[PDB]
Each structure stands twice: as C-alpha cells, then as structure tokens.
Design a binder for these strands. Structure first.
Ligand code: K
Ligand code: K
Ligand code: MG
Ligand code: NA
Length: 135
RNA sequence: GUGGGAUUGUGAAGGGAUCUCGCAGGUAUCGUGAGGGAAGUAUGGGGUAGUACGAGAGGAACUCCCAUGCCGUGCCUCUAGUUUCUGGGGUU
C-alpha cells in the first residue's frame, strides 16, 4: 500500500488519461474516469498511462451523486490490454476494472465483482481479501 | 639510352632536326590509431528500523538486495499490427 512502480514487474500500459473503466466494488459508482496515474514522471506529449496495480486519480462520471464531481483514488485490477508475465504467458481480461481506495490503499466498499489480477493483488493486500478469485 | 607520338595553316612521296610522353609498379589480405565523435541518467521498494535523535509528538541515512521511469543500441523466439504469398476458403 505504497509506491508500486519499484515493487512490480513491467506491465504493458493499458489506460491513458481519459480512459473510462468499470468500477468493480459496491461503493455505488459505475465507472471511473482516469485523471492521472501515481508515479508518472513526465515526458513531453506522452499521456500518463495506467496498468494493473497502479493507483490512479479519478472521478466518477456515472453512479451515486455523492461520489461524483470530486477527485478520488482508485486501483486498477483488470485490463483488456494483454501483458506478458515472466513465465512467458500472455494474458488479458474481457474488461477494464478499477476499485476505489483511499490514498493509503485501503479499499472503500466491501466487495469486488469479477476476478482480480495477481499483480494488483500482490501490491494491495486489502484488495486481495475481497477478491472472488486471483488471476 | 630505349619505346611511343607529334610539329604551323596553299599539293605528293621520301630524308633530317626539334619537341612531348612512358620506362616499375600492380593486385589481395591482416592490422596500427593520430585526430574527430562520444552516453547513460534518475526514482521507488526491501532491509537498516519505528532504530539513531527526541519529554512527547514524530522520525532518518550508507553497505547490500530487488524493481522501475526516461534515454540509447539492437533484435523478431513469443504476443500484437500489417497481406498484391489477391495462399485457402466463403459471398453479391
Ligand atoms: K579520443
Ligand atoms: K569532447
Ligand atoms: Mg504536445
Ligand atoms: Na501475428
């Protein structure tokens, strides 16, 4: 529940700024709009891009009105872009999904719909507890 | 000396003279390295450690280890993209 760039192997970037992904927890939000990604060091013209396990800054576009019109923190748990594990397997999900967390990584809400990537679960133990299945 | 050419424009075939040029290098490898260019640069995590310090609240760092951002030089085993192999099938 901290900086995750140095604790994770390279994962192919999936979600640049502006991507809208599903919200997999039961907070009340339906989707999340990616504003930025933590740990992004700048490069000219290059959009900040999120992948599995990344914390992102996001806003809710659809869902409970109490959750909208504000900047929140979320963690990516599923992505449609395929990445390659060190064991040589190339794997991808059917959808993109995120989960709303506090800046400390603690999961707001109490349940997760759909599976959770192992890369995301290893970096966020609180998210791994509520995962129906890992990878 | 020898070999090869030539001389100034109204003819031809012969003789001299006088000039210019060639006369020892070719061909194929392996190396030297003067000079010039010049590139790697950052972050996080583990541990140190809830330790030093501090009344408390708070709260570090180096050896070492593991990743990552940007940049650079390549490569095509995998994954992805691309098809005028119009390859093989469909279909109006
Ligand atoms: K030099
Ligand atoms: K120089
Ligand atoms: Mg621009
Ligand atoms: Na292919």
């Amino acid at each position: 529940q901290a900086n995750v760039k140095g604790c994770r192997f390279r994962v192919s970037v999936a979600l640049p700024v502006g991507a809208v992904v599903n919200c997999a927890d039961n907070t009340g939000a339906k989707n999340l709009y990616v504003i930025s990604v933590k740990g992004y060091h700048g490069r000219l013209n290059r959009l900040p891009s999120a992948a599995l396990g990344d914390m992102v800054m996001c806003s809710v576009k659809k869902g409970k009105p109490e959750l909208r019109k504000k900047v929140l923190n979320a963690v990516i748990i599923r992505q449609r872009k395929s990445w390659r594990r060190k064991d040589g397997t190339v794997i991808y999900f059917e959808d993109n999904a995120g989960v709303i967390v506090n800046p400390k990584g603690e999961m707001k809400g109490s349940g997760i719909a759909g599976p959770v990537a192992k890369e995301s679960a290893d970096l966020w133990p609180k998210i791994s507890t509520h995962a129906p299945a890992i990878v």
